[PDB]
Design a binder for these strands. Structure first.
Ligand SMILES: [Mn+2]
Ligand SMILES: [Mn+2]
Length: 183
DNA sequence: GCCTTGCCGGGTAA
DNA sequence: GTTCCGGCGCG
DNA sequence: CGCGCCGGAACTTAC
DNA sequence: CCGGCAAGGC
């Protein structure tokens, strides 16, 4: 607080499009990574990185933000035991998120993997328990939604946000000004 | 008539 | 998105 | 000696 | 993620 909104939003982006990795090497070497992947260097270097930078600074984390180019996407990586655990421990507590963290998380998750055309409002994931948590948050915010198994090939569910509540979902979650990068 | 949403394969962006 | 790789830092 | 950062990239597949 | 198709609702 109020790094907690930005944290929740980055967790959305990490859960969606990145990951939390604990490596073991030959030995007894190790590494802890916080990862967001994305195709464009804008929205990585210009939107995501400074949000991560802010948090790293607030949390006193000694590690660099690394931006590594791949053939198919960019990777924002923080190599840091402290931040790995910061985000992993937060994920464990996800059910206790307040409204601020709820909205920020759902915003980052949608950015990761929502339907971008917004002709339809859809979030895709294999993690059904995760989408069921988001579904209950959305019901509490008055945004009707259903979950079903969308992709039978990959075991990938969709949470479809009802277009009845289109304006409420876009207003309240997607174009939310909550917790900006910071005045 | 017009809108919404399940279904389901392609392949890009994870 | 995930996990290999070689290499360096630091008490 | 015993782990934890850095920079990359091959390898796979979930959006 | 994208997007065409067709069922089904008002
Ligand atoms: Mn994902
Ligand atoms: Mn994405």
């Amino acid at each position: 607080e109020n790094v907690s909104g930005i944290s929740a939003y980055l967790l959305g982006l990490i859960i969606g499009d990145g990951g939390l990795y604990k490596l073991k090497y030959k030995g007894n070497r190790s590494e802890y990574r916080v990862v967001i992947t994305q195709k464009s260097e804008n929205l990585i270097k210009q939107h995501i990185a400074p949000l991560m930078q802010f948090l790293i600074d607030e949390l006193n984390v000694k590690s660099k933000i690394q931006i590594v180019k791949g053939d198919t996407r960019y990777e924002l990586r923080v190599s840091s035991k402290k931040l790995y655990y910061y985000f992993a421990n937060m994920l464990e507590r996800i059910r206790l998120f307040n409204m601020r963290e709820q909205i920020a998380f759902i915003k980052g998750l949608y950015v990761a993997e929502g339907d971008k055309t917004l002709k339809r409002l859809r979030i895709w994931n294999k993690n059904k328990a995760l989408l069921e948590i988001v579904s209950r948050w959305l019901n509490n915010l008055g945004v009707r939604n259903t979950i079903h198994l969308d992709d039978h090939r990959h075991g990938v569910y969709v949470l479809n946000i009802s277009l009845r509540d289109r304006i409420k979902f876009v207003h309240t979650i997607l174009s939310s000004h909550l917790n900006p990068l910071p005045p």
